[PDB]
């Protein structure tokens, strides 16, 4: 049994199950306010310094935090939050000046001094048990026009490389805003799709070996591929009512977006050209790069196969087993517990009706009080 051939009701049930599973993976708004206040206080501390170079530092979110695609790490208590300082006065400032200016002051503050841990590409603050802050110093870039964010960041090899974070965020927000056409019957959706795919990749990578784990797909490549695929299916005006078929179609259209040019594979930022997210794929020291392009294709095949198996499920016991196998045991337990509580209340409320055709249970002829000896 294939996923596409199923009736729309079963397929809607599958979509609801996946969405409810992902709902527990996301972080709440109270925590988000906590992180926001934390790095806002860090930036306010930074502004207070007498150091001229560090002055006018600005802190804004990036990555999974900016694009509203946070999925809680499996077996890890600490979330990952990444931030970048902006220095308008450091257009020509050196690495040493900015790094020392940040470091000595982070050591100066009573609260931040102990939690500070250095990183090769920046600085980190270790709030214990709940989340982290990741800081990367960067100078401004002039010469090329964009929505406004051409910027350099810090890497040991070249000390400055181009990156354009904000433009990607605006592009994703504009793209995910549009809703596909819906047939007439008698968090954005793209964000949920990317979150489901990231959860699937996270649980899939564990069973693989060391080489596949180290070469597993990264979040930004999958995000931009899914965004391009979603954009074309929006432009293609194709009617979409089959739920996980949207994942199947998007994941079908992702591998076509990988571009090979003169032996170099470029998956680019649509706004800023010169930075390849697939720059790891291109370089091939000891076949490290080629193995990375493989893992995406095996993940493509596995993700296409998993909904075939879940579609092949018969019985309510095997469906839960398949969802536990593909989407983690711990998220699945809560969904089943909530379903059982809901239908137990429906028994108590009296809203459990009988379907005329199949006699199936309806959870919303109220079933009278009954006792079942095991």
């Amino acid at each position: 049994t294939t996923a596409r051939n199923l009736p729309s009701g079963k397929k809607q049930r599958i979509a609801d199950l996946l969405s409810q599973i992902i709902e527990t993976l996301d972080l709440t708004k109270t925590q988000y306010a906590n992180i926001e206040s934390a790095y806002n206080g860090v930036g306010t501390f930074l502004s207070e310094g007498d150091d001229p170079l560090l002055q006018d530092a600005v802190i804004y979110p990036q990555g999974s935090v900016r694009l509203n695609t946070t999925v809680k790490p499996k077996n890890e208590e600490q979330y990952d939050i990444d931030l970048i300082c902006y220095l308008p006065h450091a257009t020509q400032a050196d690495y040493t000046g900015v790094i020392s200016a940040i470091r000595q002051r982070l050591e100066s503050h009573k609260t931040y001094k102990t939690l500070l841990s250095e990183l090769p590409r920046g600085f980190r603050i270790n709030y214990a048990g709940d989340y982290h802050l990741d800081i990367t110093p960067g100078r401004d870039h002039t010469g090329t026009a964009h929505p406004g964010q051409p910027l350099w960041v810090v890497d040991a090899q070249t000390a400055w490389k181009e990156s354009n974070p904000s433009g990607y965020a605006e592009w994703f927000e504009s793209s995910a805003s549009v809703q596909p056409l819906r047939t007439i019957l008698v968090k954005k959706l793209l964000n949920h799709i990317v979150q489901i795919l990231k959860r699937h990749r996270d649980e899939w990578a564990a069973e693989q070996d060391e080489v596949r784990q180290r070469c597993r797909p990264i979040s930004v490549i999958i995000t931009t591929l899914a965004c391009h695929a979603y954009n074309h299916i929006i432009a293609d005006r194709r009617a979409y009512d089959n739920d996980l078929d949207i994942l199947l179609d998007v994941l079908e259209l992702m591998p076509d977006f990988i571009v090979s040019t003169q032996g170099a594979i470029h998956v680019n930022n649509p706004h800023m050209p010169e930075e390849n997210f697939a720059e790891k794929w291109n370089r091939s020291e000891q076949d490290e790069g080629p193995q990375r392009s493989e893992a995406f294709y095996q993940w493509h095949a596995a993700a296409q196969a998993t909904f075939n198996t879940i579609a092949a499920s018969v019985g309510e016991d095997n469906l839960f087993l398949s969802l536990e196998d593909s989407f983690g045991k711990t998220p699945v337990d809560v969904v089943r517990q909530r379903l059982m509580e809901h239908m137990q209340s429906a028994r108590e409320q009296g809203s459990l009706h009988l379907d005329k055709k199949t006699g199936g249970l309806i959870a919303t002829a109220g079933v009278p009080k009954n006792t079942f000896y095991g």
């Binding site: 019985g315 006699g359 199936g360 079933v367």
Partner: protein
């Protein structure tokens, strides 16, 4: 419910018509010269759940019995003994299921199922709801439903 006691068990005719309206039935018979009625069909608990064949018979003055003929409850449901694979009164080859509290335990004197209620109105939903917890047991390992069960010293059985 405060009602007159003049109400008596209805004739077979009233529930003869009732079961026909709801769902498909392969057979519906009158046997033993208007004594017993038989019903068969297919019942599905959930949307992804299996397909179950159910047989029900009744006689005036006797409690109904419900038996799931096909399937065999998924090969007896992997040993254990709870899904009540029972002799089933020796005329239908299938597991006989308990659906209501017997009159003896009820102190008020009114059973959960009485002759006033029809067969399709309550007994069929009771069987479907029983099958739902039956299939859920295979995953959970515990009867996450009505947990009523006596011990052989404390047991009192009507069957």
């Amino acid at each position: 419910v405060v009602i007159r006691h003049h109400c008596k068990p209805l004739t077979i005719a009233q529930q003869y018509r009732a079961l026909k309206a709801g769902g498909p039935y392969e057979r519906l018979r009158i046997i033993h010269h208007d004594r017993t009625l038989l019903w068969e069909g297919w019942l599905q608990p959930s949307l992804f759940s299996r397909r179950y064949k159910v047989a029900v018979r009744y006689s005036l003055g006797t409690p109904p019995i419900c038996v799931v003929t096909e399937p065999d409850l998924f090969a007896l449901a992997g040993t254990r003994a709870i899904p009540h694979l029972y002799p089933a009164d020796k005329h239908i080859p299938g597991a006989r299921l308990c659906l209501f509290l017997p009159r003896s335990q009820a102190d008020d004197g009114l059973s959960e199922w009485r002759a006033q209620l029809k067969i399709s109105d309550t007994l069929i939903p009771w069987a479907s709801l029983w099958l739902f917890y039956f299939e859920q047991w295979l995953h959970t390992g515990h009867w996450e439903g009505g947990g009523k069960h006596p011990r052989p010293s404390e047991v009192k059985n009507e069957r």
